[PDB]
Amino acid sequence: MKSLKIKKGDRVKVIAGNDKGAIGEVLSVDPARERVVVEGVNIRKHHGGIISSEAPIHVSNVQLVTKIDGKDVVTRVGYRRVDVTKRRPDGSEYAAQRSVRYLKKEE
């Protein structure tokens, strides 16, 4: 298994559910069952006292958003291969190939 296209700290826009159009930061990701937590969207109670905080929603219900010309536009992602160097646990060097994400609709 690999990771998801959405990672913690990303700024995403909600495209489905009770909070369509809401824009927030990805507070946490749960890769195993593909659910993410975005700030100030799914406010419900936990447990413990009340705890009015955010509940996870499906990762397919959010989308990475970019600011092209002053308007927020939801976009998909691609990956490009760039040459990197990785360190083996002992500390040696070797040149390897790593993927870097880019947002579409902005090249």
Partner RNA sequence: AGUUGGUGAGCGAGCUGUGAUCCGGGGGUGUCCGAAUGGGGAAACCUGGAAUGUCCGGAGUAGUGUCCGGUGGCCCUGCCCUGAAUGUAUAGGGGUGUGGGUGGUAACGCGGGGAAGUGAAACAUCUUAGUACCCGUAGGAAGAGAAAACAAGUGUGAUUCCGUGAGUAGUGGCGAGCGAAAGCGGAGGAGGCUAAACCGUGUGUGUGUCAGGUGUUGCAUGUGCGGGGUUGUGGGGGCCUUGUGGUUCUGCUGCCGCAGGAUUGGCCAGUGAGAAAUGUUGCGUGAAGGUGAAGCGUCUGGGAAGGCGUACCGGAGUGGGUGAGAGUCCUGUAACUGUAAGCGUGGCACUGGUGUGGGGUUGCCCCGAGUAGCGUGGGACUCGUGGAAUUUCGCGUGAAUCUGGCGGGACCACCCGUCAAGCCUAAAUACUCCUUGGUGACCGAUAGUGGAUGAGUACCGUGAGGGAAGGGUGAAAA
Partner RNA sequence: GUCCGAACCCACUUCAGUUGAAAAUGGAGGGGAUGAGUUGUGGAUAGGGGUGAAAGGCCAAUCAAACACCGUGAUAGCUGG
Partner RNA sequence: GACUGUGUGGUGGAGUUGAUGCGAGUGAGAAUGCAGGCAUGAGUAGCGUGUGACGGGUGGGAAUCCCGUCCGCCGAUUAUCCAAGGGUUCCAGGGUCAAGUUUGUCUGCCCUGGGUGAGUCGGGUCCUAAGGCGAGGCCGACAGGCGUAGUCGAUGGGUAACCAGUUGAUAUUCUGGUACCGGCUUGUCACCGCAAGCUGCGGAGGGACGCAGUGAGGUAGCUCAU
Partner RNA sequence: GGGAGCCCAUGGUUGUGGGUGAGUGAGUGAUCCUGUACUGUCGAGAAAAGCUUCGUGAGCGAGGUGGCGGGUCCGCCCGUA
Contact 41, 14 (CB under 8 A): yes
77 phi/psi in degrees, rounded to 5: -130, 155
Please say which residue, 60 or 67, places its beta carbon nearer to RNA: 60
User: Which of 25, 40, 43, 60 is close enough to bind RNA by CB under 7 A?
Assistant: 60
- Smallest gap, in angstroms, from Cβ of residue 55 to RNA? 5
The label of the residue with tokens 């946490």 reads 28
- Smallest gap, in angstroms, from Cβ of residue 46 to RNA? 5
Please say which residue, 70 or 80, places its beta carbon nearer to RNA: 80
- Angstrom distance (rounded) from CA 34 to CA 58: 6
Q: Binding to RNA by residue 43, rule CB under 7 A?
A: no
Q: Binding to RNA by residue 67, rule CB under 7 A?
A: no
- Angstrom distance (rounded) from CA 105 to CA 71: 13
Alpha-carbon separation of residue 74 from 32, 33, 48, 69, 85 (angstroms): 24, 23, 37, 13, 33
Please say which residue, 38 or 59, places its beta carbon nearer to RNA: 59
Tokens of 57: 């929603």
Residues near RNA, by CB under 7 A: 1-5, 7-8, 15-20, 26, 28-32, 34, 44-47, 55, 57-61, 63, 73-74, 76-81, 86-87, 89, 91, 98-99, 101, 104
